[PDB]
Amino acid sequence: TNPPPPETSNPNKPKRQTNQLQYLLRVVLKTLWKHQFAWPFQQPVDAVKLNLPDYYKIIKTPMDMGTIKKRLENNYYWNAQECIQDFNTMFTNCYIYNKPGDDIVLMAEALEKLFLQKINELPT
Numbered sequence: 001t002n003p004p005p006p007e008t009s010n011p012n013k014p015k016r017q018t019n020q021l022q023y024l025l026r027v028v029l030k031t032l033w034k035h036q037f038a039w040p041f042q043q044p045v046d047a048v049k050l051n052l053p054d055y056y057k058i059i060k061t062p063m064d065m066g067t068i069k070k071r072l073e074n075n076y077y078w079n080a081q082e083c084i085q086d087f088n089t090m091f092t093n094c095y096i097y098n099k100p101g102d103d104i105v106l107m108a109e110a111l112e113k114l115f116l117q118k119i120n121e122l123p124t
């Protein structure tokens with residue numbers, strides 16, 4: 001079975017929207033979300049549908065852009081670093097589970113390069 005997905009709201013977690021978090025939603029997430037390689041990353045890994053009995057034995061910190069998008073829309077994060085870390089976790093999980101040269105790894109690397117370009121333009 002699949003684990004429960006990562007939470008996207010938490011009634012006890014303080015909320016904030018800094019100018020950097022605004023940029024992360026309106027520029028960074030939006031740019032990656034519309035990219036041709038976004039589709040594997042727009043929702044949690046469905047280990048049932050993909051028949052991956054070991055995925056959630058290996059990956060204990062799952063993350064995906066659908067979760068990040070909802071977190072940003074909900075003002076779930078306090079700071080930009082929490083959101084940046086979620087993106088980095090998502091890419092890292094792909095690199096852990098898969099192998100060099102797999103199509104999905106090359107897709108993740110292309111999205112990560114674009115992510116890094118856009119993050120370098122974060123407002124100060």
Ligand SMILES: COc1cc(C(=O)N2CCC(N3CCN(C)CC3)CC2)ccc1Nc1ncc2c(n1)N(C(C)C)c1ccccc1C(=O)N2C
Nearest residue numbers: 039040041043044045046050052055093094097098103104
């Ligand atoms: C919408 O959800 C999906 C749909 C389909 C699908 O069957 N289709 C139809 C054909 C389309 N193709 C047609 C041909 N075009 C050239 C491109 C589009 C594309 C869409 C396949 C996978 C989906 N989700 C998915 N999420 C995260 C993954 C992942 N898969 N992969 C694969 C992507 C490797 C992994 C596989 C195994 C283990 C780990 C992963 C993994 O790391 N990650 C992040």
